[PDB]
Amino acid sequence: PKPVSKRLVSYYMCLERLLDEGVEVVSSEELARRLDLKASQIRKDLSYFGEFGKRGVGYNVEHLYDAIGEILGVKKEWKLVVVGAGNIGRAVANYTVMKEKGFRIIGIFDSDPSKIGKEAAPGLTVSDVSELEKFVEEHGVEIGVIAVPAEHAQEIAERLEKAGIKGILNFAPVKIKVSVPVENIDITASLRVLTFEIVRRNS
Amino acid sequence: EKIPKPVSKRLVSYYMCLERLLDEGVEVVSSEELARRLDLKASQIRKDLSYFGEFGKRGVGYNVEHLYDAIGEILGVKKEWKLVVVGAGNIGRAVANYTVMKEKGFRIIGIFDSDPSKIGKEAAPGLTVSDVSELEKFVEEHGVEIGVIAVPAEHAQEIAERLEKAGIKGILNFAPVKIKVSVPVENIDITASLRVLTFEIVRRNS
Ligand SMILES: NC(=O)C1=CN([C@@H]2O[C@H](COP(=O)(O)OP(=O)(O)OC[C@H]3O[C@@H](n4cnc5c(N)ncnc54)[C@H](O)[C@@H]3O)[C@@H](O)[C@H]2O)C=CC1
Ligand SMILES: NC(=O)C1=CN([C@@H]2O[C@H](COP(=O)(O)OP(=O)(O)OC[C@H]3O[C@@H](n4cnc5c(N)ncnc54)[C@H](O)[C@@H]3O)[C@@H](O)[C@H]2O)C=CC1
């Protein structure tokens, strides 16, 4: 389901962060503190990799990071479009890290004539939203990013579904209802998680 | 407010569970339903939730809204939080105009940018962008508790060091760097959300 995918990505991000610190062996307790999770749950998940995932008395950071990365398919590239050339849409098209990880934005769209024709990023010009459905099907786009206001999120999501999209990354504060998977971005949820750790420490 | 870790761990679990119940339109929940979604004994739920008396009960079950307000109150997170945004670019402007923040009690009382051509602009209705030199003074004078880092990766660790010396209580970071500060830091990374998305896409194809 959704939680096991989030944990697997959590493990991957944490192990990558552990490798940058020079750590080669990590314990389930240390992973518990970094991911805010039970240690027994971590040992239950990582037993999938057997002895290959172990080193010393803890876990082989390098082996787990490599195996999970192959499970997550980090080598594959993905074609993305962004609907909405506002503040969020411009930030996504200018996000240097996304292009490095294989998430290629080949098109960005908007409904405002003042933004159409201009450049959202180097090599990417804003296209009319009326051409979004043909653009998705012509380039075989897999992922669409919804960066339009709330009241147009569901409509854009449905046109992506009709055009053959495979998944949606949604910024708009609406519950998108489609038959493709959806990942919602909610910085308010990240803020709430931050407030919990603030009151625990500051008290 | 001395709350033990085993008790505090369940309150946040209740809190997160009750939050989804409100977004599901649920007004009344039973101890057995809470047991089903929390993987805790129903005898434990009724033991914990009796702390709120009749105020937490509604009909034959529990008042989801009253319990959500009271548990967030005990955890100390229901209060309004004063926020500042460092960086008035694309991310900073979108954060400054985000409606859902104000509804959940995250009020941005100031935004900062080191660009002289940007200083003085509006960015969002009801607020003015300021010079980053006065970030320490603004955080100290207004008691800002959460700082949002929307600066490029090059100046990100320095911004987090200034907020720590100014007395910030937390940091929301967008920049793609490892923030090395003693204050708690929460990082936003849509590539992680994309990795979750692509993994689910591939599994459905298989
Ligand atoms: N998930 C989160 O944490 C946050 C959510 N948001 C949401 O992201 C979305 C956009 O945010 P901003 O960039 O700050 O606002 P914005 O106004 O700068 O961007 C909106 C863009 O979408 C275009 N647009 C409007 N209707 C359209 C349609 N049917 N089709 C194509 N394009 C259309 C507009 O021309 C405009 O350029 C909003 O829904 C906002 O609530 C904003 C900040 C963070
Ligand atoms: N976590 C995620 O998923 C994503 C992260 N980002 C990151 O957010 C940050 C901002 O991105 P954008 O706003 O889209 O680009 P941007 O170029 O529009 O934002 C830069 C702004 O920060 C200002 N600035 C530069 N140095 C500063 C300093 N020392 N102090 C205060 N302000 C300073 C600049 O004057 C400019 O206004 C970047 O680090 C970016 O990598 C961007 C997209 C999504």
Numbering used by the authors:
A (entry chain B): 6 to 208
B (entry chain A): 3 to 208
Show me the paper's own sentences about this structure.
TmRex forms a homodimer, and each monomer was composed of two distinct domains: the N-terminal domain involved in DNA binding and the C-terminal domain involved in NAD binding, which were linked by a flexible loop (residues 78–83). The last helix α9 of the C-terminal domain was mainly responsible for dimerization through the formation of a hydrophobic interface by extending to between the N- and C-terminal domains of the other subunit.
The refined model of NADH-bound TmRex includes 409 residues of the two independent Rex monomers and two NADH molecules in the asymmetric unit; the NADH molecules were clearly observed in the 2Fo-Fc maps. In contrast to the NAD+-bound TmRex, the reduced nicotinamide of NADH was flipped by allowing the carboxamide group to form hydrogen bonds with the main chain atoms of Ile190 O and Ile192 N at the N-terminus of the helix α9. In addition, the hydroxyl group of the Tyr100′ residue formed a hydrogen bond with the Asp191 residue in the helix α9. Particularly, the N-terminal domains of each subunit tilted approximately 30° toward each other, resulting in higher proximity between the DNA recognition helices (α3) of the N-terminal domains from 35.7 Å to 29.5 Å. Because the rearranged N-terminal domains were too close to interact with the cognate DNA, the dramatic conformational change of the N-terminal domains by NADH binding allowed TmRex to dissociate from the DNA. The residues were well conserved in the Rex homologues of T. aquaticus, T. thermophilus, B. subtilis, and S. agalactiae, whereas the arginine was replaced by Met18′ in TmRex. Although the side chain of Asp192 of TmRex, which is equivalent to that of Asp188 in the T. aquaticus Rex, interacted with the hydroxyl group of Tyr100′ in the closed conformation, the Asp192 was not involved in any interaction in the open conformation. The reduced nicotinamide formed hydrogen bonds with the main chain atoms of Ile190 and Ile192 in TmRex, which is consistently found in the Rex homologous structures.
